[PDB]
Design a protein around this nucleic acid. Sequence first.
RNA 1: GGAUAGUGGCCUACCAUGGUUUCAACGGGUAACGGGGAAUAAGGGUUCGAUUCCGGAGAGGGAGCCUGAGAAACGGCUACCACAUCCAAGGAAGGCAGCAGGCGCGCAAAUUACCCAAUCCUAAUUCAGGGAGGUAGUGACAAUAAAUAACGAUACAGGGCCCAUUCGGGUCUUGUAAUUGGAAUGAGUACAAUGUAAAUACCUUAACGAGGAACAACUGGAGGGCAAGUCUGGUGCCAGCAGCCGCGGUAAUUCCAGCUCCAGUAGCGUAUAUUAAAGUUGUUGCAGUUAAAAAGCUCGUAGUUGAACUUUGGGUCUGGUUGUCCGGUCCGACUUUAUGUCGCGCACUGGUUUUCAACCGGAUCUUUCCUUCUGGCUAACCUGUACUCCUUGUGGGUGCAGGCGAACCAGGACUUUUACUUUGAAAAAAUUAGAGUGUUCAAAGCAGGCGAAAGCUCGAAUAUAUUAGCAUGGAAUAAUGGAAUAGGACGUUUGGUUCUAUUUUGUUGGUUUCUAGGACCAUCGUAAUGAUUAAUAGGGACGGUCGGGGGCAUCAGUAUUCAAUUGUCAGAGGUGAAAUUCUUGGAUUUAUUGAAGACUAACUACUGCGAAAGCAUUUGCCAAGGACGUUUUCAUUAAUCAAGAACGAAAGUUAGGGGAUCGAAGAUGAUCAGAUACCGUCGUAGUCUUAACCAUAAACUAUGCCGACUAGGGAUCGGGUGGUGUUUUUCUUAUGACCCACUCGGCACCUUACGAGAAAUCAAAGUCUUUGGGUUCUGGGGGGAGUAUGGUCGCAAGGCUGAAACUUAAAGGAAUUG
RNA 2: GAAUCUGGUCAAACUUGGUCAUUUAGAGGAACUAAAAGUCGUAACAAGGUUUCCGUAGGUGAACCUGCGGAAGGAUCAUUA
RNA 3: CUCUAACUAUAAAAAUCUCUCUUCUC
Lengths: 129, 151, 144
Amino acid sequence: TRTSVLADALNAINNAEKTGKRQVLIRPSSKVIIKFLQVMQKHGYIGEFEYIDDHRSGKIVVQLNGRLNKCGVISPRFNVKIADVEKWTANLLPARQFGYVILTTSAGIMDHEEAHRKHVSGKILGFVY
Amino acid sequence: MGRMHSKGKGMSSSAIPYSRNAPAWFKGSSDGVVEQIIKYARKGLTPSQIGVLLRDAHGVTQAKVITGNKILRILKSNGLAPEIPEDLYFLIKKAVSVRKHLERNRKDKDAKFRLILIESRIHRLARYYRTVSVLPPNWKYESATASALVN
Amino acid sequence: GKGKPRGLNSARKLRVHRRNNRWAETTYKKRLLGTAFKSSPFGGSSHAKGIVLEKIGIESKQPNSAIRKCVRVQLIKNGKKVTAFVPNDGCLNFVDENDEVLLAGFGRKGKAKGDIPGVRFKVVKVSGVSLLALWKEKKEKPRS
RNA sequence: GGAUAGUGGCCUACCAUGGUUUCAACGGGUAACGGGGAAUAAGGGUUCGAUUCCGGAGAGGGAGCCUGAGAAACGGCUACCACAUCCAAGGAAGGCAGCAGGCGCGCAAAUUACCCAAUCCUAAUUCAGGGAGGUAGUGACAAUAAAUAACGAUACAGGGCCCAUUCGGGUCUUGUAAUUGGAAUGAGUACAAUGUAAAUACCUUAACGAGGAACAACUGGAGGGCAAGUCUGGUGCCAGCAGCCGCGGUAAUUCCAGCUCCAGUAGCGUAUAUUAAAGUUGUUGCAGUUAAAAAGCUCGUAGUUGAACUUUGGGUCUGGUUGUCCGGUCCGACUUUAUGUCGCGCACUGGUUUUCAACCGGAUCUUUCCUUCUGGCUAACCUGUACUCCUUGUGGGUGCAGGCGAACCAGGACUUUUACUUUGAAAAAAUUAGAGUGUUCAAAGCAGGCGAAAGCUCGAAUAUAUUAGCAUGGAAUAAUGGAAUAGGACGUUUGGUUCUAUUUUGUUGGUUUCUAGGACCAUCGUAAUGAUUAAUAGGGACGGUCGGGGGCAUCAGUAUUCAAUUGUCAGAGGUGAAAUUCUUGGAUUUAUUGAAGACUAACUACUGCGAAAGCAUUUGCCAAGGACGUUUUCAUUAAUCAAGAACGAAAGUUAGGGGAUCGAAGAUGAUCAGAUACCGUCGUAGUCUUAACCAUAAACUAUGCCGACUAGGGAUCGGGUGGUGUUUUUCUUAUGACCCACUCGGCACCUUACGAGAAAUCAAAGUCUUUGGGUUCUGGGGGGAGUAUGGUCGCAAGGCUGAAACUUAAAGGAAUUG
RNA sequence: GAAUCUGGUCAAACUUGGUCAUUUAGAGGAACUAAAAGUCGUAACAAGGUUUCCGUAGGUGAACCUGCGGAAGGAUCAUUA
RNA sequence: CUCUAACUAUAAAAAUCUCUCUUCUC
Ligand SMILES: [Mg+2]
Ligand SMILES: [Mg+2]
Ligand SMILES: [Mg+2]
Ligand SMILES: [Mg+2]
Ligand SMILES: [Mg+2]
Ligand SMILES: [Mg+2]
Ligand SMILES: [Mg+2]
Ligand SMILES: [Mg+2]
Ligand SMILES: [Mg+2]
Ligand SMILES: [Mg+2]
Ligand SMILES: [Mg+2]
Ligand SMILES: [Mg+2]
Ligand SMILES: [Mg+2]
Ligand SMILES: [Mg+2]
Ligand SMILES: [Mg+2]
Ligand SMILES: [Mg+2]
Ligand SMILES: [Mg+2]
Ligand SMILES: [Mg+2]
Ligand SMILES: [Mg+2]
Ligand SMILES: [Mg+2]
Ligand SMILES: [Mg+2]
Ligand SMILES: [Mg+2]
Ligand SMILES: [Mg+2]
Ligand SMILES: [Mg+2]
Ligand SMILES: [Mg+2]
Ligand SMILES: [Mg+2]
Ligand SMILES: [Mg+2]
Ligand SMILES: [Mg+2]
Ligand SMILES: [Mg+2]
Ligand SMILES: [Mg+2]
Ligand SMILES: [Mg+2]
Ligand SMILES: [Mg+2]
Ligand SMILES: [Mg+2]
Ligand SMILES: [Mg+2]
Ligand SMILES: [Mg+2]
Ligand SMILES: [Mg+2]
Ligand SMILES: [Mg+2]
Ligand SMILES: [Mg+2]
Ligand SMILES: [Mg+2]
Ligand SMILES: [Mg+2]
Ligand SMILES: [Mg+2]
Ligand SMILES: [Mg+2]
Ligand SMILES: [Mg+2]
Ligand SMILES: [Mg+2]
Ligand SMILES: [Mg+2]
Ligand SMILES: [Mg+2]
Ligand SMILES: [Mg+2]
Ligand SMILES: [Mg+2]
Ligand SMILES: [Mg+2]
Ligand SMILES: [Mg+2]
Ligand SMILES: [Mg+2]
Ligand SMILES: [Mg+2]
Ligand SMILES: [Mg+2]
Ligand SMILES: [Mg+2]
Ligand SMILES: [Mg+2]
Ligand SMILES: [Mg+2]
Ligand SMILES: [Mg+2]
């Protein structure tokens, strides 16, 4: 069964990036996937994606440009206190100069730097760099 | 492609058309379609057979597209919904049939295992229909109750 | 993806799985069962005194041909009997029969060291004085 | 009801039969007092916490009690048990887990010292008392700083050299020599004084106190790991060393010594325990094809996890924070000074609408609500009443009835509930962190600093604790609840009902009013009146199928072994070779046949069905099932699964049936040194079945299940689509059978690495240090050992669960060369 | 208002058996290790000279043999010859 | 750029083995 849909989306993105493609077809296309790809667009790790209405969960077509190197979900959406954000960035991101731990706060789904700017923190969604 | 109680992996299904609204070529009336559904139910037909009859002999693609309500919903609005849901009733019928085959010949073990599978499916569906309160909370499945409900 | 559960409410089975797996170790099993107190010649004791019963030497293993000069000592704290090894060239003669001797561990976590079979204990002191002081003639046996 | 100071099954009397539990109750163990904390340290953690503080308990083990406010007190009593003491044998007196000290125990822990100086405490209260406490004694538990020499002048030397006639001055320096000089200083003693309750001791300091400065530094090691010897002598697989690998057999870089050297150094070496190393406990973060490890398979409660969907946008105004451009302010190059100058492109403070760009908010308009009223209080001007202070100017007002309530109260009213997260109050001090501070530095301590010396002073900072509780802002993620019989939501509706009671008619008793206040009940209207999709998730209906899936009952085939009849006639079996065995009572073969039981050949394949075992003659019946087709139906019903269950090869066990073949045991005949093994001939049990057990297999794909994605090439099975396709023949067509293309599902297969592995290899064993889709089981070196014991199942066989003591430096996996 | 004394009550403790737990001997029995220069065979590693191994049953100085089902970890990935 | 053919077929017996393993740097 499909438990974590965002996991399937990010795995498809990773597989279609490693092989050198420029597009992905993500099937289930929830809110969280849309927000995740929107954050990636805002930070440039992704190109020009697309929602395809089916009246049944829709789908998404993602355009890439080879700029991304790895997505990935933290499947147990751990409650991340504002003190533990730095530990997650150290454990996940490869360098302090870039990378983004995408986490869902009460103020929406945001990158870790933006959440630290709002001085708000919530559960962790995934990581992109 | 799950096949709850076996190793099958098929996906043979039907793709509902994108357009929810009525097809352009359909000329029948929604009230007439509801009357047809009511008459078919009064004949003693379960909703699935009603839908198959409307799809084959008539231009009804599906009731929700034409009327706006589902077949079982339409029957319930008119008070013709059976006291046992159709899928659970068919599972009961299958289980009683396999139990009859078993009591007429003991040595068949494969049908014994299949009866175990059918009884597990019956229990799962009964639990679902019980948490939604379609069935009373005291509803359960034992021997000679399946025969009483079927007969 | 992995054998262990990953859900946010799966702390119980993770903890009990770790607790059940911890018995596969030897240090943890020894520490929790308390085998050292019950079965070992000393119960959690680094050193222990004893009385010399007899004065034996044991041959070594195959690749090493010699006879290591040991001594059988009955422990005073509980009454167990163990062989122990006197470590040096001329220290066998220093220890005499039926004198109190303070045995220590052999350094290999209660297991036979090197080529010496069925021994697990050194000899550090004899008749109140240490072997190392006798071997370099810094002190002498009181001979009581 | 009693007792309690008081609630309370705390106890009694009578009733009810209840309370906890797979979210581990109850029981057992703890070489367990709990905590603040300690060690350890990338992060996560692991271990310890008897002890300097807070709590609890105890005074040999038990009970009982007086006094008081407070004790079930024990340096208070009573009794029993255990242990004891003096005894004039009648009696009396005991409580160190207080400070000392003793015996014992054990590897393991201090002087019968001084004193109320300091901290305090008790009392009638300064004064008395305090083994609380402080001071000293022992004290290498740990911790801080740090002596064991420093510098010349000479002889033996080495490097930068003026060049290089060989030189060589040593021109320029740096070491080595029992040569050789002058200094400084403590470690010790010791006048004193300080210190202290009195004394030690420390700080200071007279007088002594260094030449081999004998005032003499050890502890381990010198093959590797691991820094330092293949120097000398001794012993010769002895003695011994060696944490591990190893050294020792007449030339030992390893044993015992001497020399030299190495490491730490007033410390170093050992033992046990423990932490990091241990990604060898793996939540971060381990492995399961073969190295240890996927339950034989399936169902299934609990547990864990679980598809998508319900306001997203915009425009304006406006508040802080930034980097903007520069204003004032001004400072660095100009040196005893500056401006004029060279600008760091402004070291302090603003215009910050200079466009800018954000980085956060706040209010506003959406059919866009943020709980709203009910009185306050009207804070405020949509109030307009008397009007205008002042330039004729809405800049600006004195101000009273409507009337703005989030600018705020204090009251009824309803509150979907959480999980989560921000902030705050809280989490005792000591400890950890950390600010200030010349204890001579430091460990530390909370001190100190500054006057002119004439009293003036800054301190004793902060943070963290990640759980539980309280408050608070947020609304993504995750869960629950609304309205389906409308018993749904609103209204000036319009009707009725128990009431309730402010005042009002003095007060009190009722009767109704009136007014206002909840609902129970009808009826009247307002409204867009109210049900998300139908997951390339699942269940179910239907359609034609498909299958060596399963049961029962029938059908056939030759074969085998016997038997009947018949035929001839010396051999036939069998083997590497023989023999045992059957045969002129005519065996072996030869023809018909008959009986029995088993089996289902050839078709038979990198083919099919099934959950796994397993399933192969025909036909009928019985029910079941996968796959495909489906504009059919329900709408999360699902995935994996402790507990529980169903099947489970062969073998084996009880009985009843059969009884052909083949064949455990057995009987022999061979082969051999032996052969009660392999070759051979007979041959019971068994094989074949109907009931009842058994639950184990190399039950293997040694690869758990569900889900997604990633790469090319053909075929093959089941289904379904299309072909202007080909043979079919029933004139044409419909089928069927093929051919081509596509698709779904299945057993599979070839190539390849661009991915993974220790590789053999894997299209999954990939998408794993760029580590997290859900979930179950198992493994932590080998052996002992899947053994014993204890359960549990079984008639029995045995199955499930399942260690330790001890021993060992390897066992093991893949591959390479021989 | 003392001795004494009635009924309770808290109840220590004693006797008597019963029960469980831990130590504790103990004739004898079955083992397992280490030591490898004893003895009888030579099972396995090659086709180990009967291919190997698993389950189950029987047998025997001993490793082991045999029967019935498996498995290749086989010595074959292969008969459209 | 055109094709589907040939074939066999032996198994006698053979047990066992003691020392001792020794550095690689320009
Ligand atoms: Mg010897
Ligand atoms: Mg204790
Ligand atoms: Mg403590
Ligand atoms: Mg503790
Ligand atoms: Mg203790
Ligand atoms: Mg205390
Ligand atoms: Mg007490
Ligand atoms: Mg005592
Ligand atoms: Mg008093
Ligand atoms: Mg007491
Ligand atoms: Mg006392
Ligand atoms: Mg006291
Ligand atoms: Mg007293
Ligand atoms: Mg004492
Ligand atoms: Mg004291
Ligand atoms: Mg000590
Ligand atoms: Mg001393
Ligand atoms: Mg000295
Ligand atoms: Mg030395
Ligand atoms: Mg040495
Ligand atoms: Mg030496
Ligand atoms: Mg070295
Ligand atoms: Mg030598
Ligand atoms: Mg491991
Ligand atoms: Mg193996
Ligand atoms: Mg294995
Ligand atoms: Mg398995
Ligand atoms: Mg469940
Ligand atoms: Mg969801
Ligand atoms: Mg504190
Ligand atoms: Mg500190
Ligand atoms: Mg009223
Ligand atoms: Mg669906
Ligand atoms: Mg067909
Ligand atoms: Mg026969
Ligand atoms: Mg004849
Ligand atoms: Mg056949
Ligand atoms: Mg077939
Ligand atoms: Mg189970
Ligand atoms: Mg059988
Ligand atoms: Mg029988
Ligand atoms: Mg035989
Ligand atoms: Mg014989
Ligand atoms: Mg035979
Ligand atoms: Mg025979
Ligand atoms: Mg098994
Ligand atoms: Mg297995
Ligand atoms: Mg092991
Ligand atoms: Mg084993
Ligand atoms: Mg047993
Ligand atoms: Mg190998
Ligand atoms: Mg009395
Ligand atoms: Mg022999
Ligand atoms: Mg052999
Ligand atoms: Mg042979
Ligand atoms: Mg042989
Ligand atoms: Mg063999």
